[PDB]
Structures are given as C-alpha cells and as structure tokens.
Amino acid sequence: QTKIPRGNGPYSVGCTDLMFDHTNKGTFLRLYYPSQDNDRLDTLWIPNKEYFWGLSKFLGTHWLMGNILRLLFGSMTTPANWNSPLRPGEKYPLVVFSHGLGAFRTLYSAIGIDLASHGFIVAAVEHRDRSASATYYFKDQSAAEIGDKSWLYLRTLKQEEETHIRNEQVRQRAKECSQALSLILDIDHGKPVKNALDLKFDMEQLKDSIDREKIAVIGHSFGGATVIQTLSEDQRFRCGIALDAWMFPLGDEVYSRIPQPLFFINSEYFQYPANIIKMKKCYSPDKERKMITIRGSVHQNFADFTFATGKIIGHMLKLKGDIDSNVAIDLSNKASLAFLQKHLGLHKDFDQWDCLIEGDDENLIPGTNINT
C-alpha cells in the first residue's frame, strides 16, 4: 500500500482536520490522536489537487508537473483511521507541529502518526504566512458551508526581501502555533466550535482530553526556527524539538529568551556553519540544550516524501540519504519520545531511548559534524 510507516506505539491512530475560524486569520490543523477503533487505514495523504500545483510551483516547475504528481500520489493514503473516534478515558500530552518551507500540514504524518501511536495528540498546523506550498481558507461562512475554497500559494522572495519577510513569517508562524494551542485548550475546556470543514468527527470529543501541563512544540526546517520563536513567546510550551532547523528567519533577540529545554535533531548533509552557529547561540549552562546528528541523512528525511519513492529515484531527488528512511525516522522519533518523557514528566517507557539523546547509536553523531 502506502510506504509511510505505521506508528510503532501501542495505540491505534486516528486523523481528522480542524479549521476555526473559517478566515485566513483562523487556525487550520491536521490532528493525529489515539483512536478508539482501528477499522481501516484510509486517511488521504495529500487531499486536494491544489497542493500538487503548489508543490510544482515550489519546485520551479509548472502545472504539467503538478498534474503528474497528482497522478502519482493523489490517491496515496497515510496509515491513520480517518475520523475515527478519540480513545476515551485518558488525558493526552499535546504536540503542536510546524511544517517547513514549501510543505503543508499533511507532509509530516510519519512523525505525527508515530507520536499519536505512543499516546500523544498532535496538531500539525497549516501556516498562512505564504510559506506553505498551498493552503486555503474561506472568505465567509457561506463559502465554508459550500466548500468554496480560497487558495493561497507560496510567495517567492527577492533577495532584498529575505531578511525582513522571513522574520515576519517566523513571527506569524509562532503566533499560529500559539493560536492553535489556544484553540485546542479552549475546546478541551468546553468552548463550542463549529469546524469550518464538515467532517464526521465531533470536536466535542476533545473536551477534557488534554493533559494541559504536558505541551511541546516540534517543527522541521522553517518549523524548527518556528519552535524557537514559539518557545520564546509562549511559556505554555514546556519544551521544544527542532528537526534540522533553518535558523536564518530568527532575530538576534530570541536566543537569550528561551527558558524551556530544547532539542536539536539534525541531518548530516543539510547543516552548515552559518546555520549551526545560531544553534550554539542558544546554549547556556543554566539551560538544557541537546543536539544529535543522524548519520547519512538529508534534510528531507524528516518529511513524508522520503517514503513516497523508490530508493534510487529518491536519492536522485534528495528525498533519501545514505541511511534507510525508516531507520532514520525511527531514530528521530525515539529520541524525541525520550526527550518528551524527560521534560514533560511522562510516566511511559520512553526513557529506554535516553541513550539516543546522547547520540549513542551507530547511526548517530553526538553534537554536530560542524565544529564551529
């Protein structure tokens, strides 16, 4: 079937989408969560043709390639139970997840599904900062009722625009992570919400479902910078995991304003000194910062298209590294779970992977190959 790996944990996984409010300033997220039932693994991975058009634009091609992607991938599933009921009787720790440049909310389901299978609720935000390849919203309530979507595509920047616009974007991304957290926490305490999407998952199930002290933010690339900006602004997030962070968007002021623990998980082949030096600026003896590098990995080992092609085409497109993609994502996910247990205070068995936080594995490098 799909080659996106099923979650390794003992919980079955459901998935749904939530948009509220309906406007371009509302929150849009894909939720992965522990499900009551494991009926059938039928979640559509990339759910609209316009995402494929957006990806082609991001990759520098035109509408013909978008339609080719749609033919290849437009019916692929990802292994979660679409709209399955939430598993009752437990309060779950919560992760807010931020996607990279040219991605969108559905492209990190390998991570989201594995976290949910270990008993997390995961809210993968879709950013409206024009960093997503595509996203959509509704211009009024009637448009939402009809499914009359307004699409917003990735913005390309002139070199003169990069410093200012990328910092504006990372600030909007952090606001969107904090707004998504507030939406979920408000639903958890009984706020009535009318999902702008008509879906057979009743959001009232989320009432009293969140362990409100155990909140983390995780993100890849642009989303790794978003982790750091979000932690700086919002202390409801108790720790962060930055997956191959692209640090360029961040202003100098954030590096001293992050009280929470922070974990950098890097690929071997993406990092460079000008990027790594900003990660080192976060280090201080009064704070917990950990860094590991996954041997033989490329930037996109963290994103779902690392599973979507064969070994040789994937390597040529830089979707795959020297390391097997399942081995790489398992290391990132297991090290993440250990870090989350330690700094959220979970009473699980994730500390069996504490050694991964130290880089103690044949496929891990403690710290970074970039000595700067």
The residues that are catalytic are 221, 244, 299
Residue type at 330 in one-letter notation: D
Quick one: DSSP state of residue 297? -
- For ligand 8U9, the closer of residues 177 and 206 by Cβ is 177
Q: What number of chain residues touch ligand 8U9 (CB under 6 A)?
A: 19
Name which position in 31, 101, 111, 298 contacts ligand 8U9 (CB under 6 A).
101
Q: What is the DSSP letter of 279?
A: H
Q: With binding defined as CB under 6 A, does residue 275 bind ligand 8U9?
A: no
Does residue 171 interact with ligand 8U9 by CB under 6 A? no
CA distance 339 to 361: 16
Is residue 59 close enough to count as binding ligand 8U9 by CB under 6 A?
Answer: yes
Please list, in sequence order, all residues whose beta carbon lies within 8 angstroms of the beta carbon of residue 11, skipping any fewer than 6 positions away: 34, 35, 87, 116, 117, 118, 119
| CA separation for the pair 228, 246 (Å, rounded) | 11
List, in order, residues 6 or more apart from 59 with CB less than 8 Å away: 65, 102
Which one of 94, 107, 241, 243 is in contact with ligand 8U9 (CB under 6 A)? 107
- Give the nearer residue to ligand 8U9 in terms of CB position, either 138 or 269: 269
Q: Does 69 bind ligand 8U9 (CB under 6 A)?
A: yes
Q: How far is the CB of 132 from ligand 8U9 (least distance, A)?
A: 9
The Cα–Cα gap between 268 and 307 comes to 18
Q: At what angle do helices 222-233 and 162-188 cross, to 10 degrees?
A: 60
Crossing angle of the two packed helices 63-73 and 49-58, in degrees rounded to 10: 130
Residue 220 lies near ligand 8U9 (rule: CB under 6 A):
yes
Q: How far is the CB of 282 from ligand 8U9 (least distance, A)?
A: 20
User: How far apart are CB 205 and ligand 8U9 at their closest, in Å?
Assistant: 30
Q: Is 331 in the site for ligand 8U9 (CB under 6 A)?
A: no
Which residue stretch of 2-10, 90-98, 228-236, 298-306 sits at the interface with ligand 8U9 (rule: CB under 6 A)?
Answer: 298-306
User: Which pairing describes strands 77-78 and 43-44: parallel, antiparallel, or unpaired?
Assistant: antiparallel
Interface residues with ligand 8U9 (CB under 6 A) are: 55, 58-59, 69, 100-103, 107, 220-222, 299-300, 303-305, 317, 319
